[PDB]
Design an enzyme around this catalytic site. Structure first.
Site, PDB file in Angstrom:
ATOM      1  N   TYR A 234       2.955  83.729  38.375  1.00  0.00           N
ATOM      2  CA  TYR A 234       3.899  83.068  37.139  1.00  0.00           C
ATOM      3  C   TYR A 234       5.154  82.945  37.233  1.00  0.00           C
ATOM      4  O   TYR A 234       5.717  81.726  37.614  1.00  0.00           O
ATOM      5  CB  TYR A 234       3.311  84.033  35.985  1.00  0.00           C
TER       6      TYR A 234
ATOM      7  N   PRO B 119      -1.863  79.449  27.912  1.00  0.00           N
ATOM      8  CA  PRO B 119      -2.972  78.927  27.405  1.00  0.00           C
ATOM      9  C   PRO B 119      -2.912  78.942  25.775  1.00  0.00           C
ATOM     10  O   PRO B 119      -1.901  79.645  25.157  1.00  0.00           O
ATOM     11  CB  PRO B 119      -3.950  80.083  27.866  1.00  0.00           C
TER      12      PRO B 119
ATOM     13  N   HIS C 279       1.266  83.688  29.358  1.00  0.00           N
ATOM     14  CA  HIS C 279       0.504  84.384  30.272  1.00  0.00           C
ATOM     15  C   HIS C 279       0.855  85.567  31.187  1.00  0.00           C
ATOM     16  O   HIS C 279       0.304  86.435  31.356  1.00  0.00           O
ATOM     17  CB  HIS C 279      -0.401  83.286  31.117  1.00  0.00           C
TER      18      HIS C 279
ATOM     19  N   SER D  80     -12.320  79.788  33.873  1.00  0.00           N
ATOM     20  CA  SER D  80     -12.189  80.981  33.004  1.00  0.00           C
ATOM     21  C   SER D  80     -13.170  80.970  31.903  1.00  0.00           C
ATOM     22  O   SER D  80     -13.473  80.041  31.354  1.00  0.00           O
ATOM     23  CB  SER D  80     -10.599  81.249  32.802  1.00  0.00           C
TER      24      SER D  80
END
Length: 585
Positions: free
Chosen positions: A78, A91, A305, A518
């Site tokens: 990230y 997300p 995230h 996912s």
């Protein structure tokens, strides 16, 4: 004492990872290229070679740290990513469509949601969160005390006690500090409603309207870092930023949506607010949780995230929502009631130029996202389990077939495996594009081979078996991504020039997840979604239920190859094909 009784993330044996690695990529690169990678890996892992040297340093690192990959992973996954957080990284979870006849209905929902947030944080801070195998709970403590600072080349995840505690309320792109706790005093759902009303009123004051500074947090990370640098020059901006950086979370009172309230559209608003013209600026991405309570009934939460993963995000969200279905416990009025404080900003000609840029940049993201919410309703977990198959592995295989039948090739695929068994455990990767998956999809799509259905079924079950086996390998910390990452970065520390092992195009390609997936199962009527991780890839987040499976598929319009609609269609055909296969005899 206070030392974790959890096990440390295991370091797999060097040769085990190297063999698996080659096995993973063989069918994903040319024969010539594979031959070259074989020699490269052979030399890298030879007795007395560089590989074993790095392996020793990793073992040393394992002993000296709680988790040898924590730092490397956090940055690689990230903090180093320069892409804007919206769509690319953050997300979004979409709650069921709500109905707000009046503004007070919207505000009551918000007051209740905030109440749910505080009750959850109370359990969290009291270590009263429900702890099979013991798992790491650090992620929970990063839910409301985290803030992702932008950087020129690398972001910084700040780990934060204020008094009182407060949340930031976003309304009409204006931000307000809403104290929710004061001396273990916790605002009644009623006081929150009253405070929200004041906010809505002030937010509607033209003479007091300030620039939509939140729009800046939706830009690329280096671009936002540069703009934030301009901001920090002024003492007033420093104060406001500080308040945002230390809030529990945000609550965005979004304006009316303009389009129909379908699942796809509501998700779009949660992903990027629909751009500046809509609710795109009524946000602040650096903050981990932004709960949206739209006037038209569109609600959900946008998640940053870096601080925690899907499992923890859902447990928190579902606890809120359930809490909202419960009798309101009587909470005491505050006397007197102070007026929420609007965050002031000292604008400049520069900042004005940054706003214009961010607006256009964010607009490119909006028009560029190709998103679809497809609900497969022929069957779900019930049918799959009757096939002696794990629902996740079954669906993962379906995605492989869908990709193959549509694009005629498999690609490096990503699927997170939780490694919370081990201290500070985040995740690792499950490589679903297995050799078995290739044999299966080929037999299904190669008309000219005329493979018997009975044979296809065997290949189907072997692919699922392989999927499950890789899954178990990853969760027990015996997989290859984190391992290679640490070996790579330990080498980099030795010399900026990386070993041929990691300069090899095969390695570079292995980490370009054209298919990023996912599973985010929920018990509530909500769903999770996210964008692709590479320009020519997809975003596939599914939610399997007993009789159905929800699929959230994203891709970019810029790439002529990908198509969310077509991929959703290929998924349907793949699931049907697989059903028929399991139903022969």
């Amino acid at each position: 004492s206070e030392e974790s009784g959890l096990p440390k993330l295991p370091v797999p044996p060097l040769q085990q990872t190297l063999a698996t690695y080659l096995q993973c990529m063989r069918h994903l690169v040319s024969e010539e290229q594979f031959r070259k990678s074989q020699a490269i890996v052979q030399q890298f892992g030879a007795p007395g070679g560089l590989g074993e040297t790095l392996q020793q340093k990793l073992l040393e690192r394992q002993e000296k740290t709680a988790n040898w990959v924590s730092e490397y992973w956090l940055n690689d996954m990230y903090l180093n990513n320069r892409l804007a957080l919206p769509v690319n990284s953050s997300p979004a979870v979409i709650f069921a469509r709500q109905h707000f006849p009046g503004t007070d209905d919207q505000l009551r929902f918000a007051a209740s949601l905030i109440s749910g947030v505080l009750s959850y944080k109370a359990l969290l801070d009291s270590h009263s969160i429900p702890t099979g195998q013991p798992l790491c709970m650090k992620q929970y403590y990063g839910l409301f005390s985290s803030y992702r600072l932008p950087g020129h080349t690398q972001d910084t995840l700040v780990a934060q006690m204020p008094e009182p505690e407060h949340v930031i309320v976003a309304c009409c792109n204006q931000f307000f500090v809403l104290d929710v706790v004061i001396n273990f005093r916790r605002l009644s759902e009623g006081d929150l409603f009253t405070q929200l009303r004041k906010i809505v009123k002030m937010a509607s004051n033209a003479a007091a309207r300030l620039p939509p500074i939140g729009l800046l947090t939706s830009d690329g990370r280096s671009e936002w870092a540069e703009a934030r640098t301009v901001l920090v020059k002024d003492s007033t901006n420093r104060d406001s930023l500080d308040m945002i950086e230390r809030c529990i979370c945000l609550v965005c009172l979004d304006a009316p949506g303009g389009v129909e309230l379908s699942d796809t559209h509501r998700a779009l608003q949660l992903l990027h607010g629909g751009g500046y013209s809509k609710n795109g600026a009524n946000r602040w991405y650096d903050k981990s949780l932004q709960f949206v309570v739209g006037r038209d009934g569109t609600c959900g939460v946008v998640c940053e995230h870096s601080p925690f993963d899907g499992i923890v995000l859902v447990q928190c969200t579902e606890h809120l929502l359930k809490h909202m279905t419960q009798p309101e416990l009587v909470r005491s009025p505050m006397v007197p009631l102070p007026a929420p404080r609007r965050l002031r900003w000292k604008c400049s000609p520069e900042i004005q130029g940054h706003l214009a840029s961010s607006a256009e940049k964010l607009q490119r993201i909006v028009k560029n996202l190709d998103f679809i919410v497809y609900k497969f309703d022929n069957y779900g977990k019930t049918f799959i389990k009757k096939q002696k198959c794990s629902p996740d592995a079954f669906i993962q295989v379906a995605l492989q077939l869908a990709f193959y039948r549509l694009h005629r090739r498999l690609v490096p695929t990503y699927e997170s495996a939780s490694i919370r068994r081990f201290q500070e455990g985040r995740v690792d990767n499950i490589r679903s594009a297995t050799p078995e998956a290739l044999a299966f999809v080929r037999a299904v799509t190669d008309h000219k081979a005329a493979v018997p259905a009975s044979e296809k079924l065997l290949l189907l079950k072997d692919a699922i078996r392989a999927q499950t086996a890789y899954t178990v390998m990853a969760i027990t910390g015996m997989a290859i991504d984190n391992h290679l990452l640490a070996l790579r970065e330990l080498a980099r520390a030795m010399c900026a020039a990386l070993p041929e092992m990691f300069m090899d195009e095969t390695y570079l390609m292995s980490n370009r997840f054209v298919l990023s997936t996912s599973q985010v199962p929920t018990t509530t009527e909500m769903f999770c979604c996210y964008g692709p991780v590479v320009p020519n890839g997809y975003g596939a987040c599914y939610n399997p239920q007993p009789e159905t499976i929800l699929f959230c598929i994203s891709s970019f319009h810029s790439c002529a190859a990908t198509s969310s609609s077509k991929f959703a269609k290929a998924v349907e055909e793949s699931l049907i094909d697989m059903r028929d296969l399991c139903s022969l005899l």
